Amino acid sequence: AEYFRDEGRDILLFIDNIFRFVQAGSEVSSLLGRMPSQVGYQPTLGTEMGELQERITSTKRGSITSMQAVYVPADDYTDPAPATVFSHLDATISLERSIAERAIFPAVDPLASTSRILDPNIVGEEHYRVAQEVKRVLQRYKDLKDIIAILGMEELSDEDKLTVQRARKIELFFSQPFTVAQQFTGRPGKYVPVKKTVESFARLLNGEGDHIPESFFYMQGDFDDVLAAYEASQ
C-alpha cells in the first residue's frame, strides 16, 4: 500500500483482526524465549504495534483511509492487545455482545465509540449537537439501568421516563439493515447519508416519534422510513 500512497494515489486499507497479528507475535515471542508480560503477551508488544501502525498513517504525498478490525479476547476490552490498539486511531468503534444478543446487529456502543473529527468545526454544529445529545441521553439511560432493572419504569420522574423512552428508541434506531446482511435479516440493504442521519436523530430528539412505538425504529433507514412504517401499521 505504501507504493500507491507514495505516488499520490488514495488508498482504502482494510486490515481484518489486527489482534491476529498480535497473537502471532505473542506465540513467536513465547517460542523465542522472551519473558512474557501481563497475560502471556510479548514484552515488545508496544513497539510491535508501533511498527505496524505508524506505517498506516496518511502523509502529505498520499492518503491512506484505514479501517481496521480488532478482535477482543473473550469480551475483555482491558486486554493488552486492544488497549495498545486504542491509542493508534482517529476513530474508535466498540462492538458489544450485549447489543448483538439484543438483535441490534450493528452492535456499536455509542458511549464506548469516539472519534477525533467529532468537532463542530470539522463535521458541523448540528451534527456535533445531535451526537452529543444522543450520547447524553444514552448515558442517562445507562445510569438509570439499575433503577429500571428492579423498581421498573414507573418510579422514574416524567423527564427521566421520557429520556429512557427516547434512549430505547435511539438504541433501536441505530440498527440498520445492511446490503451484505440480507441472509440474516429479510430486509433490503439500506444506505443512509450523514445529513439524513443527523436530521432523523434531531427529529427523534425533538419529540417527533414519541407517539411511535419502539418496534418501528428497529432496522430502518432515516426517520421517514420509520414514519412510513408507522403509517402503514396505523
Binding site: 475483555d76 482491558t78 428492579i150 423498581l151 421498573g152 414507573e154 418510579e155
Partner: protein, 97 residues
C-alpha cells in the same frame, strides 16, 4: 471484571435492596389486610345509608327542582373532580393509571 471487591460490594447492596423490598412487601400485605378490615367495617354503614337513600329517592318524585344535591341540573358547564392518589410512591402503575 471490574474487581472482586466492587462486585462483592454490589452484591451486598442488592442483597440489602432485596431485604428492604421483602420487608416492604410484608408490611404492605399487613396494611392491605388492615385496610380491607376497615373497608368491611365501614361497609354496613354505607349499605344502610344507601338503602335509606334509595327509599327516600323512590319516595320523592318530580319535586321542586328535585331537591338541591339531587337536582338534575341541565346545561352542564362546570365539573369538579375528586381524584384520590397515594401519599407516597413505590406503588407501581397505580398512580400513573
Amino acid at each position: 471484571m471490574p474487581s472482586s471487591r466492587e462486585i462483592k460490594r454490589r452484591i451486598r447492596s442488592v442483597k440489602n435492596v432485596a431485604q428492604i423490598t421483602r420487608a416492604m412487601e410484608m408490611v404492605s400485605a399487613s396494611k392491605m389486610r388492615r385496610a380491607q378490615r376497615n373497608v368491611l367495617a365501614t361497609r354496613p354503614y354505607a349499605d344502610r345509608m344507601r338503602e335509606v337513600m334509595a327509599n327516600l329517592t323512590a319516595r320523592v318524585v318530580g319535586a321542586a327542582r328535585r331537591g338541591t344535591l339531587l337536582e338534575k341540573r341541565e346545561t352542564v358547564k362546570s365539573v369538579a373532580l375528586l381524584v384520590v392518589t397515594p401519599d407516597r410512591g413505590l406503588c407501581g402503575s397505580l398512580v400513573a393509571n
